[PDB]
Design a protein around this ligand. Sequence first.
Ligand code: HEM
Length: 293
Amino acid sequence: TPLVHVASVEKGRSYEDFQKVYNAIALKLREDDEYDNAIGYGPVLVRLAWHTSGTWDKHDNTGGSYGGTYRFKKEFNDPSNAGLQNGFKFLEPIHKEFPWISSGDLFSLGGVTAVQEMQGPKIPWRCGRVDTPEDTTPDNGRLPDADKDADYVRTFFQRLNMNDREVVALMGAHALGKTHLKRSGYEGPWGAANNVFTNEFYLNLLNEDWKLEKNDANNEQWDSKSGYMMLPTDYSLIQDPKYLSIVKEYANDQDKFFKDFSKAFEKLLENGITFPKDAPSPFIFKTLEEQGL
Ligand code: HEM
């Protein structure tokens, strides 16, 4: 019997309340600009939103964004989550200022805010995740390995109810940030901008001259002369003919990638949640730039 998690709006809160939380996150993103050699906290916040949602299992509705369980030791100490403590620390003063927002709402909103502030697509976002107790924390090992092939990736993402297009779209988030040897056993960025959300991941996969090398952790990764890298799982997207077609599509249509990413990312962040028929519609937050802030 799969658990049922019903969204419950934080008491009396509406769009304006959540836009304030968005703004606080966005202003802090602007302020704390030196983190990770001046990349800023955008990428790590996106990874945090993904890893807190990515524990979901469609078969029994365990894990997922609803319960905000990363706040518990078992999950924040998941080896797969190494480095995410930085995103958590970033969000702490936001949680302190807005103690009414649920942990799951904050983790997921962190990701949405980061994508939008980094010039990504608008990502509609729904409130109402409710904190669940420590015994609801999913065991480690539900997040994906990076050393695997296309068959692994395809099978892995079926557990999150994602199809080929959704998988390829979601992986485009690798435009952001970088791998860090001490965190994951991989080193290097996927591209040049690091803190601007674009379709660069796909362009790089297709256009760079990739060499299969061993990094300083004795793990294989694909490196280019430009100083970029791809994980084996990233590279698998051009090895598999079905993934390859989609990679070419996104590399050649920025708008299409934006639209598809937005849908897949919202879906990721909402997996496992039942929204009542009379729940508010998804919110689309204005960026700081759009507000003149
Ligand atoms: C096969 C699936 C995936 C694998 C194996 C994978 C693996 C990894 C690894 C090993 C890192 C480096 C961590 C570090 O050393 O700091 C990373 C970083 C990152 N991942 Fe993925 N990932 C996957 C999918 C995704 C998805 C679906 C998203 C979001 C939509 C995402 C967003 C990110 C971001 C933004 C970073 C940069 C973090 C930072 O710079 O601090 N990844 N991923």
